[PDB]
Design a binder for this molecule. Structure first.
Ligand code: SSA
Ligand code: SSA
Lengths: 421, 421
């Protein structure tokens, strides 16, 4: 959500956002429809005043003249029903269109689709294997670490892990959550469903509605990221200045319908329907200097998890057509997957300024007693099972066993993942 | 699913069992529909036999006799068509009826509903406090360990834990997976959605269908327990005798509609729509002595976990009208909750002999090379957040802080949970 007053005063800035982000919206028709609504509310306020005027006259009206006044009263009341009616269906179409207006991207964002994305930094490299390396699925097959029968129970894009890799999945999630807690974020374990309002608040609805699974015969929806719950905890509340920045590390199960991903990562642990994710969410004051200081620590937090995980990664500056309607800036962290000879993303770091605060109604009292929309940001801390694909392949040993990074040894009790047999 | 040969060789026991378990089944009509389907099958075989000969003989039949056989074959033709439509309708009504036939309760189960459940024994004493104990919602409110705002995001029967209590939830789930993997059970991390076929296999469908949330626009349902996935894994395989008993400890988010008396003791951590559960599942050979050894193992395991968690508990033998249509036996383990002055359910141990093996089609090759339906059992290992309600009330200290049991201090990193603020 955008300030309708800057939309009215500077629609060109918003037309470049629509153009460069590829949003299918006609701003001129939005602004025309907005004028029409404001016209109908003037003429409806006028008929509402006129109606009350005639009504006031009726207590003082003698019979030959109060007969006239009810004739006038009923016609005024009838034009008021048409204006109320036409207004209600035009304001509703305006609401819908405003929910599609994108935030302008930052001035250094690459312009174009995914192909304009630009590697910013690379830390670490592909391992040099003395032996022929297996991919994560053959390493799972070989050591008995996943259960392919899950596919007949739950359908495709499903996984079930076994033995030491079942335990490593849980060890990694507790590790992420403990790392976030010693970095000052408040740990929260959360549900994975929410009402519509929370989806609207983050911007997952309307644009990404097809990516969300509804729970049938309820008004609940399964969340694709704990960002949907963490951002709605404070709707309609005015936070005190001194509470800022709010920094939440929330864990929840995540469900994605993966509509449109035809034949895309149908293979192992990369693109499943349900996974676990620890999320980093920051709500801060409305200054770019506080958004940028929070974006930088969100990124360093995820670079640090990856360095402790001993994984090779690169950061990528995300282009305007690929960051999504509400983003000011987005940087993805990608880890090297050997079996694909390429980097695959594990983390997306976004700064959304006040586009979600205006939708979800997040506000605070600033140092001068003024009330403002806060700025929000979020980044992945660690999502399983997809990092297990990069950890297996980069840490495989010649015998097909896998070593666990030094930081995860306290969490596993062992230095090597063992075949389940 | 019961054995139809035993159903009609022993109707008196299934009639007793339909009465003692409060099942709404007219056994007399089921048994009649069964005689009908079986007589239609024999008859359509006798007309198919005779139909075949009439058809073969009419090319060789002399005039007067060619006409008698044509007429008889025509008569057998119409009859066969009528026997086929009746068999198809009758068989479908009979499969829907067989799915509701209950297993006989074991002879020592109290007869009656919930009221007749008997305490077998209680281990451990109720805590003695040097102060007036707070209840677990007060301890959470005082220490800042949960987030009440989650009700606006997600609705009622939601919980969001914060700070040390969020981390204690993850620690309890990891400790129960490690305890189970140390007791010889295979660790698995599982999905929470499955196809219809898996719910019919456990018995959750048709009888408990209202207790299950469905994912709209899909053929999938959220599982109320990992038992639905773990029981459906080996459908259609014939397990080698030597793989037995299969011991699986599976972890998955569990989702429950709870559309069974909303308003039943709900506020706090006791009945929520989404929780986490580690499950003990055993598939063993079709011997009562194998079921009974597995049942005692499953119970000793949850007892040992509650001993490690330093919690007072009692065992309850469940009555025939409270155990559900598929159980042979059911023993609840209940932990003392000081603020209610009573024990509340934490673990539910079931033996279902082959009632689930026949619906899910679970078979093994017995040591004489005969293929048999196996027997299945299951018991909770640890479910959260309900165990946190008893742990906070029982382990509270004078200042409103909660200590950590000696066995969980390694999982927690500290001997006492601290306020978040
Ligand atoms: N279907 C999927 N299967 C497995 N992991 C996935 C899937 N979709 C997303 N993820 C993981 O979750 C991470 C974040 O997802 S995201 O859409 O890109 N970003 C968000 O949801 C933001 N809240 C940042 O966390 C991805 O980097 C990836 O690691
Ligand atoms: N809605 C709920 N909220 C919280 N915990 C629940 C809920 N429903 C069930 N439980 C927990 O899960 C445990 C087992 O649930 S059960 O229906 O009795 N039995 C099963 O599911 C069996 N599969 C054994 O686990 C309960 O003992 C309780 O600890």
């Amino acid at each position: 959500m955008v300030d309708l007053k800057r939309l009215r005063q500077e629609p060109e800035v918003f037309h470049r956002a629509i153009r460069e982000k590829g949003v299918a919206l006609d701003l001129e028709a939005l602004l025309a429809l907005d004028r029409e609504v404001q016209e109908l509310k003037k003429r409806l306020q006028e008929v509402q005043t006129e109606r009350n005027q005639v009504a006031k006259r009726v207590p003082k009206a003698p019979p030959e003249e109060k007969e006239a006044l009810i004739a006038r009263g009923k016609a005024l009341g009838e034009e008021a029903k048409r204006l109320e009616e036409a207004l209600r269906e035009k304001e509703a179409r305006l609401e819908a269109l405003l929910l599609q207006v994108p935030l302008p991207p930052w001035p250094g964002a690459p312009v174009g689709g995914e192909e304009a994305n630009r590697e910013i930094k690379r830390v670490g490299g592909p391992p040099e294997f003395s032996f022929p390396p297996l991919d994560h699925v053959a390493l799972m097959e070989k050591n008995g670490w996943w259960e392919p029968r899950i596919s007949q129970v739950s359908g495709s894009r499903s996984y079930a892990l076994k033995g030491d890799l079942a335990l490593y999945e849980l060890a990694l999630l507790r590790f992420a959550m403990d790392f976030m807690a010693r970095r000052g974020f408040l740990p929260m374990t959360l549900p994975s469903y929410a009402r519509e309002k929370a989806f609207l608040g983050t911007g997952h609805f309307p644009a990404y509605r097809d990516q969300v699974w509804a729970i049938a015969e309820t008004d609940l929806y399964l969340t694709g990221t704990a960002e949907v719950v963490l951002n709605a905890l404070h709707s309609g509340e005015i936070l005190p200045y001194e509470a800022l920045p709010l920094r939440y590390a929330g864990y929840a199960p995540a469900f994605r319908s993966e509509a449109g991903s035809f034949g895309k990562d149908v293979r192992g642990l990369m693109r499943v329907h349900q996974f676990h994710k620890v999320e980093q969410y920051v709500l801060t004051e409305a200054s770019l200097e506080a958004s940028d200081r929070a974006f930088q620590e969100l990124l360093e937090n995820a670079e640090e998890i990856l360095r402790l995980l001993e994984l090779p990664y690169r950061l990528v500056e995300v282009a305007t057509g690929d960051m999504g309607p509400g983003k000011w800036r987005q940087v993805d962290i990608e880890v090297y997957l050997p079996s694909e000879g390429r980097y695959r993303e594990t983390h997306s770091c976004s700064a959304l300024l006040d586009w979600q605060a205006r939708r979800a109604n997040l506000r605070y009292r600033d140092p001068e007693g003024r009330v403002r929309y806060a700025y929000t940001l979020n980044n992945t801390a660690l999502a399983t099972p997809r990092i297990l694909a990069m950890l297996l392949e980069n840490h495989q040993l010649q015998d097909g066993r896998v070593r666990v990074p030094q930081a995860l040894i306290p969490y596993m009790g062992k230095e090597v993942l063992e075949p389940c047999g």
